[PDB]
């Protein structure tokens, strides 16, 4: 079967943080909004 590259060239707008593609740059940005942060770690001490 197939594993890896898509075939017809991957999309230029593909999130790496989680792994989500989008058929619209602007869209990707909106998605990245829930990825960027201010700390290198994820404190969940409530
Ligand atoms: Zn993402």
């Amino acid at each position: 079967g197939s594993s890896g590259s898509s075939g017809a060239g991957e999309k230029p707008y593909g999130c790496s943080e989680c792994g989500k593609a989008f058929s619209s740059k602007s869209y990707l940005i909106i998605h990245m909004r829930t990825h960027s942060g201010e700390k290198p770690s994820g404190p969940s001490s409530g």
Side-chain angles (χ1 to χ4, degrees):
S2 207
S3 200
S5 272
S6 61
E10 204 160 335
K11 295 203 199 205
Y13 322 114
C15 175
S16 282
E17 286 303 332
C18 61
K20 210 177 181 81
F22 314 103
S23 64
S24 31
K25 199 275 199 152
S26 302
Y27 209 63
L28 164 66
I29 299 160
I30 301 166
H31 170 89
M32 294 310 282
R33 300 177 71 275
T34 61
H35 273 292
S36 208
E38 279 163 301
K39 294 193 89 153
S41 189
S44 299
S45 61

mmCIF file of all heavy atoms in Angstrom:
data_model
loop_
_atom_site.group_PDB
_atom_site.id
_atom_site.type_symbol
_atom_site.label_atom_id
_atom_site.label_comp_id
_atom_site.label_asym_id
_atom_site.label_seq_id
_atom_site.Cartn_x
_atom_site.Cartn_y
_atom_site.Cartn_z
ATOM 1 N N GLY A 1 0.806 -1.207 0.000
ATOM 2 C CA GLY A 1 0.000 0.000 0.000
ATOM 3 C C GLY A 1 0.842 1.260 0.000
ATOM 4 O O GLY A 1 2.023 1.226 -0.346
ATOM 5 N N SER A 2 0.234 2.377 0.387
ATOM 6 C CA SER A 2 0.933 3.655 0.424
ATOM 7 C C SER A 2 1.147 4.117 1.862
ATOM 8 O O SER A 2 0.260 3.983 2.707
ATOM 9 C CB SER A 2 0.149 4.715 -0.352
ATOM 10 O OG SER A 2 1.010 5.719 -0.859
ATOM 11 N N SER A 3 2.329 4.660 2.135
ATOM 12 C CA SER A 3 2.661 5.138 3.473
ATOM 13 C C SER A 3 3.616 6.325 3.403
ATOM 14 O O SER A 3 4.785 6.175 3.050
ATOM 15 C CB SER A 3 3.287 4.012 4.298
ATOM 16 O OG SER A 3 3.197 4.287 5.686
ATOM 17 N N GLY A 4 3.108 7.505 3.743
ATOM 18 C CA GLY A 4 3.929 8.702 3.713
ATOM 19 C C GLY A 4 3.403 9.742 2.744
ATOM 20 O O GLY A 4 2.229 10.111 2.794
ATOM 21 N N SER A 5 4.273 10.216 1.858
ATOM 22 C CA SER A 5 3.891 11.223 0.875
ATOM 23 C C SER A 5 2.499 10.939 0.318
ATOM 24 O O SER A 5 2.116 9.783 0.135
ATOM 25 C CB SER A 5 4.910 11.266 -0.265
ATOM 26 O OG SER A 5 5.974 12.154 0.035
ATOM 27 N N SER A 6 1.747 12.002 0.050
ATOM 28 C CA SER A 6 0.397 11.868 -0.483
ATOM 29 C C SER A 6 0.427 11.344 -1.916
ATOM 30 O O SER A 6 -0.294 10.410 -2.263
ATOM 31 C CB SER A 6 -0.329 13.213 -0.435
ATOM 32 O OG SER A 6 0.337 14.181 -1.228
ATOM 33 N N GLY A 7 1.269 11.955 -2.745
ATOM 34 C CA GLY A 7 1.379 11.538 -4.131
ATOM 35 C C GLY A 7 1.384 12.712 -5.090
ATOM 36 O O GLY A 7 2.377 12.956 -5.776
ATOM 37 N N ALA A 8 0.273 13.439 -5.139
ATOM 38 C CA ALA A 8 0.155 14.594 -6.022
ATOM 39 C C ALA A 8 0.665 15.859 -5.342
ATOM 40 O O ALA A 8 0.074 16.929 -5.477
ATOM 41 C CB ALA A 8 -1.290 14.774 -6.462
ATOM 42 N N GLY A 9 1.766 15.729 -4.609
ATOM 43 C CA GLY A 9 2.337 16.870 -3.917
ATOM 44 C C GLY A 9 1.522 17.283 -2.708
ATOM 45 O O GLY A 9 0.342 17.607 -2.829
ATOM 46 N N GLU A 10 2.153 17.267 -1.538
ATOM 47 C CA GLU A 10 1.477 17.640 -0.302
ATOM 48 C C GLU A 10 1.040 19.102 -0.339
ATOM 49 O O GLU A 10 1.528 19.887 -1.152
ATOM 50 C CB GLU A 10 2.394 17.402 0.900
ATOM 51 C CG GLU A 10 1.647 17.202 2.207
ATOM 52 C CD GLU A 10 2.484 16.498 3.257
ATOM 53 O OE1 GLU A 10 3.418 15.761 2.876
ATOM 54 O OE2 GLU A 10 2.206 16.684 4.460
ATOM 55 N N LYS A 11 0.117 19.460 0.547
ATOM 56 C CA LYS A 11 -0.386 20.826 0.617
ATOM 57 C C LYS A 11 0.574 21.721 1.392
ATOM 58 O O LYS A 11 1.203 21.303 2.364
ATOM 59 C CB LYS A 11 -1.767 20.850 1.278
ATOM 60 C CG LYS A 11 -2.839 20.138 0.471
ATOM 61 C CD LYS A 11 -4.229 20.642 0.823
ATOM 62 C CE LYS A 11 -5.304 19.651 0.403
ATOM 63 N NZ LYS A 11 -6.616 20.319 0.180
ATOM 64 N N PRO A 12 0.693 22.984 0.954
ATOM 65 C CA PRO A 12 1.574 23.965 1.594
ATOM 66 C C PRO A 12 1.071 24.385 2.971
ATOM 67 O O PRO A 12 1.828 24.912 3.786
ATOM 68 C CB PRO A 12 1.544 25.152 0.629
ATOM 69 C CG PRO A 12 0.244 25.026 -0.087
ATOM 70 C CD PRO A 12 -0.026 23.551 -0.199
ATOM 71 N N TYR A 13 -0.212 24.149 3.225
ATOM 72 C CA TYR A 13 -0.817 24.505 4.502
ATOM 73 C C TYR A 13 -1.129 23.258 5.324
ATOM 74 O O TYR A 13 -2.273 22.809 5.383
ATOM 75 C CB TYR A 13 -2.096 25.314 4.277
ATOM 76 C CG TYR A 13 -2.003 26.284 3.122
ATOM 77 C CD1 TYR A 13 -2.776 26.112 1.979
ATOM 78 C CD2 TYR A 13 -1.142 27.374 3.170
ATOM 79 C CE1 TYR A 13 -2.694 26.995 0.920
ATOM 80 C CE2 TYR A 13 -1.054 28.263 2.117
ATOM 81 C CZ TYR A 13 -1.832 28.070 0.994
ATOM 82 O OH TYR A 13 -1.747 28.952 -0.058
ATOM 83 N N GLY A 14 -0.100 22.703 5.958
ATOM 84 C CA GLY A 14 -0.283 21.513 6.769
ATOM 85 C C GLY A 14 0.290 21.668 8.164
ATOM 86 O O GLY A 14 1.506 21.738 8.339
ATOM 87 N N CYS A 15 -0.589 21.724 9.159
ATOM 88 C CA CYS A 15 -0.164 21.874 10.546
ATOM 89 C C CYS A 15 0.701 20.694 10.981
ATOM 90 O O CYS A 15 0.414 19.545 10.647
ATOM 91 C CB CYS A 15 -1.382 21.994 11.464
ATOM 92 S SG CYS A 15 -0.974 22.030 13.239
ATOM 93 N N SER A 16 1.760 20.988 11.729
ATOM 94 C CA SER A 16 2.669 19.953 12.207
ATOM 95 C C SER A 16 2.449 19.680 13.692
ATOM 96 O O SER A 16 2.661 18.565 14.167
ATOM 97 C CB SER A 16 4.121 20.366 11.962
ATOM 98 O OG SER A 16 4.486 20.170 10.607
ATOM 99 N N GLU A 17 2.022 20.708 14.419
ATOM 100 C CA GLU A 17 1.774 20.581 15.850
ATOM 101 C C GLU A 17 0.978 19.314 16.153
ATOM 102 O O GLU A 17 1.358 18.520 17.015
ATOM 103 C CB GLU A 17 1.021 21.806 16.372
ATOM 104 C CG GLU A 17 1.884 23.052 16.478
ATOM 105 C CD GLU A 17 3.102 22.843 17.358
ATOM 106 O OE1 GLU A 17 3.035 21.998 18.275
ATOM 107 O OE2 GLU A 17 4.122 23.528 17.130
ATOM 108 N N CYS A 18 -0.127 19.132 15.439
ATOM 109 C CA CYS A 18 -0.977 17.963 15.630
ATOM 110 C C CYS A 18 -1.031 17.115 14.363
ATOM 111 O O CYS A 18 -1.015 15.886 14.423
ATOM 112 C CB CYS A 18 -2.391 18.395 16.028
ATOM 113 S SG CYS A 18 -3.234 19.420 14.780
ATOM 114 N N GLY A 19 -1.094 17.782 13.213
ATOM 115 C CA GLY A 19 -1.149 17.074 11.947
ATOM 116 C C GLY A 19 -2.473 17.262 11.235
ATOM 117 O O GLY A 19 -3.170 16.291 10.936
ATOM 118 N N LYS A 20 -2.825 18.514 10.963
ATOM 119 C CA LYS A 20 -4.075 18.827 10.282
ATOM 120 C C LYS A 20 -3.823 19.699 9.055
ATOM 121 O O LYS A 20 -3.176 20.741 9.146
ATOM 122 C CB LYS A 20 -5.036 19.539 11.237
ATOM 123 C CG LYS A 20 -6.501 19.281 10.930
ATOM 124 C CD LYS A 20 -7.409 19.941 11.954
ATOM 125 C CE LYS A 20 -8.876 19.670 11.654
ATOM 126 N NZ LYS A 20 -9.302 18.328 12.138
ATOM 127 N N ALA A 21 -4.340 19.264 7.911
ATOM 128 C CA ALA A 21 -4.173 20.007 6.668
ATOM 129 C C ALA A 21 -5.382 20.894 6.391
ATOM 130 O O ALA A 21 -6.464 20.673 6.935
ATOM 131 C CB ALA A 21 -3.943 19.049 5.507
ATOM 132 N N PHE A 22 -5.191 21.900 5.544
ATOM 133 C CA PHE A 22 -6.265 22.822 5.197
ATOM 134 C C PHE A 22 -6.099 23.340 3.771
ATOM 135 O O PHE A 22 -4.988 23.631 3.331
ATOM 136 C CB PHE A 22 -6.294 23.997 6.178
ATOM 137 C CG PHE A 22 -6.184 23.579 7.616
ATOM 138 C CD1 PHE A 22 -4.991 23.731 8.306
ATOM 139 C CD2 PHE A 22 -7.271 23.034 8.279
ATOM 140 C CE1 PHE A 22 -4.886 23.348 9.629
ATOM 141 C CE2 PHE A 22 -7.172 22.649 9.603
ATOM 142 C CZ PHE A 22 -5.977 22.805 10.279
ATOM 143 N N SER A 23 -7.214 23.452 3.055
ATOM 144 C CA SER A 23 -7.192 23.931 1.678
ATOM 145 C C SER A 23 -7.294 25.452 1.629
ATOM 146 O O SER A 23 -7.860 26.018 0.693
ATOM 147 C CB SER A 23 -8.337 23.305 0.881
ATOM 148 O OG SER A 23 -9.596 23.719 1.385
ATOM 149 N N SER A 24 -6.745 26.109 2.646
ATOM 150 C CA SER A 24 -6.777 27.565 2.722
ATOM 151 C C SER A 24 -5.821 28.074 3.797
ATOM 152 O O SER A 24 -6.036 27.857 4.989
ATOM 153 C CB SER A 24 -8.198 28.049 3.017
ATOM 154 O OG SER A 24 -8.906 27.105 3.801
ATOM 155 N N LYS A 25 -4.763 28.752 3.365
ATOM 156 C CA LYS A 25 -3.773 29.295 4.287
ATOM 157 C C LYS A 25 -4.448 29.950 5.487
ATOM 158 O O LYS A 25 -4.264 29.522 6.627
ATOM 159 C CB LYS A 25 -2.882 30.312 3.571
ATOM 160 C CG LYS A 25 -1.568 30.580 4.285
ATOM 161 C CD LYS A 25 -1.726 31.633 5.369
ATOM 162 C CE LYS A 25 -0.385 32.230 5.764
ATOM 163 N NZ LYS A 25 -0.525 33.625 6.267
ATOM 164 N N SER A 26 -5.232 30.992 5.224
ATOM 165 C CA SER A 26 -5.933 31.708 6.283
ATOM 166 C C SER A 26 -6.501 30.736 7.313
ATOM 167 O O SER A 26 -6.378 30.950 8.519
ATOM 168 C CB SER A 26 -7.060 32.558 5.693
ATOM 169 O OG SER A 26 -6.560 33.473 4.733
ATOM 170 N N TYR A 27 -7.122 29.666 6.828
ATOM 171 C CA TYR A 27 -7.711 28.661 7.705
ATOM 172 C C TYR A 27 -6.670 28.102 8.670
ATOM 173 O O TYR A 27 -6.886 28.062 9.882
ATOM 174 C CB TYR A 27 -8.318 27.526 6.879
ATOM 175 C CG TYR A 27 -9.487 26.845 7.554
ATOM 176 C CD1 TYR A 27 -10.652 27.544 7.843
ATOM 177 C CD2 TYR A 27 -9.425 25.501 7.904
ATOM 178 C CE1 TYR A 27 -11.722 26.925 8.460
ATOM 179 C CE2 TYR A 27 -10.491 24.874 8.520
ATOM 180 C CZ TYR A 27 -11.637 25.590 8.796
ATOM 181 O OH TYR A 27 -12.701 24.970 9.411
ATOM 182 N N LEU A 28 -5.537 27.673 8.124
ATOM 183 C CA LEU A 28 -4.460 27.116 8.935
ATOM 184 C C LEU A 28 -4.126 28.037 10.102
ATOM 185 O O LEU A 28 -3.984 27.589 11.240
ATOM 186 C CB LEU A 28 -3.215 26.889 8.076
ATOM 187 C CG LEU A 28 -1.905 26.674 8.836
ATOM 188 C CD1 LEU A 28 -1.955 25.377 9.629
ATOM 189 C CD2 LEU A 28 -0.725 26.669 7.875
ATOM 190 N N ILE A 29 -4.001 29.329 9.813
ATOM 191 C CA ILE A 29 -3.687 30.314 10.841
ATOM 192 C C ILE A 29 -4.670 30.229 12.003
ATOM 193 O O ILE A 29 -4.268 30.147 13.164
ATOM 194 C CB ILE A 29 -3.704 31.745 10.271
ATOM 195 C CG1 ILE A 29 -2.658 31.890 9.164
ATOM 196 C CG2 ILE A 29 -3.453 32.758 11.379
ATOM 197 C CD1 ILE A 29 -2.917 33.057 8.237
ATOM 198 N N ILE A 30 -5.959 30.249 11.683
ATOM 199 C CA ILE A 30 -7.000 30.171 12.700
ATOM 200 C C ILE A 30 -6.843 28.916 13.552
ATOM 201 O O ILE A 30 -7.116 28.930 14.753
ATOM 202 C CB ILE A 30 -8.405 30.177 12.070
ATOM 203 C CG1 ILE A 30 -8.609 31.446 11.239
ATOM 204 C CG2 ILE A 30 -9.471 30.069 13.150
ATOM 205 C CD1 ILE A 30 -9.813 31.383 10.326
ATOM 206 N N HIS A 31 -6.400 27.832 12.924
ATOM 207 C CA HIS A 31 -6.204 26.568 13.625
ATOM 208 C C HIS A 31 -4.982 26.635 14.535
ATOM 209 O O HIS A 31 -4.995 26.108 15.647
ATOM 210 C CB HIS A 31 -6.045 25.424 12.622
ATOM 211 C CG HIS A 31 -5.597 24.139 13.247
ATOM 212 N ND1 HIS A 31 -6.475 23.202 13.753
ATOM 213 C CD2 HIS A 31 -4.357 23.635 13.445
ATOM 214 C CE1 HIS A 31 -5.792 22.180 14.236
ATOM 215 N NE2 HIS A 31 -4.505 22.417 14.061
ATOM 216 N N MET A 32 -3.928 27.289 14.055
ATOM 217 C CA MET A 32 -2.699 27.425 14.828
ATOM 218 C C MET A 32 -2.941 28.238 16.096
ATOM 219 O O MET A 32 -2.170 28.156 17.053
ATOM 220 C CB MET A 32 -1.611 28.090 13.981
ATOM 221 C CG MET A 32 -1.162 27.247 12.800
ATOM 222 S SD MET A 32 -0.757 25.554 13.267
ATOM 223 C CE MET A 32 0.865 25.782 13.993
ATOM 224 N N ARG A 33 -4.013 29.021 16.096
ATOM 225 C CA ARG A 33 -4.355 29.850 17.245
ATOM 226 C C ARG A 33 -4.466 29.005 18.511
ATOM 227 O O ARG A 33 -4.164 29.470 19.611
ATOM 228 C CB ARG A 33 -5.671 30.589 16.996
ATOM 229 C CG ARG A 33 -5.633 31.509 15.787
ATOM 230 C CD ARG A 33 -6.985 32.161 15.540
ATOM 231 N NE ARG A 33 -7.300 33.167 16.551
ATOM 232 C CZ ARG A 33 -7.858 32.882 17.722
ATOM 233 N NH1 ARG A 33 -8.162 31.627 18.027
ATOM 234 N NH2 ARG A 33 -8.115 33.852 18.590
ATOM 235 N N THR A 34 -4.901 27.759 18.348
ATOM 236 C CA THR A 34 -5.055 26.849 19.477
ATOM 237 C C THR A 34 -3.826 25.960 19.636
ATOM 238 O O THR A 34 -3.918 24.844 20.146
ATOM 239 C CB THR A 34 -6.301 25.958 19.315
ATOM 240 O OG1 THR A 34 -6.181 25.158 18.134
ATOM 241 C CG2 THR A 34 -7.563 26.804 19.235
ATOM 242 N N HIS A 35 -2.677 26.463 19.197
ATOM 243 C CA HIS A 35 -1.429 25.714 19.293
ATOM 244 C C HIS A 35 -0.347 26.546 19.973
ATOM 245 O O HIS A 35 0.379 26.053 20.837
ATOM 246 C CB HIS A 35 -0.960 25.284 17.903
ATOM 247 C CG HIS A 35 -1.537 23.977 17.454
ATOM 248 N ND1 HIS A 35 -1.217 22.771 18.043
ATOM 249 C CD2 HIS A 35 -2.418 23.689 16.467
ATOM 250 C CE1 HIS A 35 -1.876 21.799 17.438
ATOM 251 N NE2 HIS A 35 -2.613 22.330 16.479
ATOM 252 N N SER A 36 -0.244 27.811 19.577
ATOM 253 C CA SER A 36 0.754 28.711 20.145
ATOM 254 C C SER A 36 0.501 28.932 21.634
ATOM 255 O O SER A 36 -0.631 28.834 22.104
ATOM 256 C CB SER A 36 0.739 30.053 19.409
ATOM 257 O OG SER A 36 2.011 30.674 19.457
ATOM 258 N N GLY A 37 1.567 29.230 22.371
ATOM 259 C CA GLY A 37 1.442 29.460 23.798
ATOM 260 C C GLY A 37 2.464 30.451 24.318
ATOM 261 O O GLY A 37 3.115 31.146 23.539
ATOM 262 N N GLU A 38 2.603 30.517 25.639
ATOM 263 C CA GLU A 38 3.552 31.433 26.261
ATOM 264 C C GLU A 38 4.538 30.676 27.146
ATOM 265 O O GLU A 38 5.496 31.251 27.663
ATOM 266 C CB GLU A 38 2.811 32.486 27.088
ATOM 267 C CG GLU A 38 2.253 33.629 26.258
ATOM 268 C CD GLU A 38 1.190 34.420 26.995
ATOM 269 O OE1 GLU A 38 0.170 33.818 27.392
ATOM 270 O OE2 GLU A 38 1.377 35.642 27.174
ATOM 271 N N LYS A 39 4.294 29.381 27.319
ATOM 272 C CA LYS A 39 5.159 28.543 28.141
ATOM 273 C C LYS A 39 5.557 27.273 27.394
ATOM 274 O O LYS A 39 4.774 26.699 26.636
ATOM 275 C CB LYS A 39 4.456 28.177 29.450
ATOM 276 C CG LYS A 39 4.206 29.369 30.359
ATOM 277 C CD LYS A 39 3.794 28.929 31.754
ATOM 278 C CE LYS A 39 5.004 28.719 32.651
ATOM 279 N NZ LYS A 39 4.673 28.933 34.088
ATOM 280 N N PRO A 40 6.801 26.822 27.611
ATOM 281 C CA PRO A 40 7.329 25.615 26.969
ATOM 282 C C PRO A 40 6.671 24.343 27.495
ATOM 283 O O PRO A 40 6.700 23.301 26.840
ATOM 284 C CB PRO A 40 8.814 25.638 27.337
ATOM 285 C CG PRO A 40 8.881 26.427 28.599
ATOM 286 C CD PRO A 40 7.788 27.456 28.502
ATOM 287 N N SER A 41 6.077 24.437 28.681
ATOM 288 C CA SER A 41 5.414 23.293 29.296
ATOM 289 C C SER A 41 3.911 23.531 29.409
ATOM 290 O O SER A 41 3.419 24.614 29.096
ATOM 291 C CB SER A 41 6.004 23.019 30.681
ATOM 292 O OG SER A 41 5.529 21.791 31.204
ATOM 293 N N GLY A 42 3.188 22.509 29.857
ATOM 294 C CA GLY A 42 1.750 22.627 30.004
ATOM 295 C C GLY A 42 1.290 22.396 31.429
ATOM 296 O O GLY A 42 0.880 21.297 31.802
ATOM 297 N N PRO A 43 1.359 23.451 32.255
ATOM 298 C CA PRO A 43 0.952 23.383 33.662
ATOM 299 C C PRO A 43 -0.557 23.231 33.822
ATOM 300 O O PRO A 43 -1.327 24.068 33.354
ATOM 301 C CB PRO A 43 1.418 24.725 34.231
ATOM 302 C CG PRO A 43 1.454 25.642 33.057
ATOM 303 C CD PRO A 43 1.838 24.792 31.879
ATOM 304 N N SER A 44 -0.971 22.158 34.488
ATOM 305 C CA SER A 44 -2.389 21.895 34.707
ATOM 306 C C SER A 44 -2.682 21.698 36.192
ATOM 307 O O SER A 44 -3.338 20.734 36.584
ATOM 308 C CB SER A 44 -2.827 20.657 33.922
ATOM 309 O OG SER A 44 -2.641 20.844 32.529
ATOM 310 N N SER A 45 -2.189 22.622 37.012
ATOM 311 C CA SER A 45 -2.394 22.549 38.454
ATOM 312 C C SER A 45 -3.709 23.213 38.850
ATOM 313 O O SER A 45 -4.002 23.379 40.033
ATOM 314 C CB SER A 45 -1.230 23.217 39.190
ATOM 315 O OG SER A 45 -1.129 24.587 38.844
ATOM 316 N N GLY A 46 -4.499 23.591 37.849
ATOM 317 C CA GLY A 46 -5.774 24.232 38.113
ATOM 318 C C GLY A 46 -5.621 25.539 38.864
ATOM 319 O O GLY A 46 -5.538 25.518 40.091
HETATM 320 ZN ZN1 LIG B 1 -2.674 21.589 14.659
#
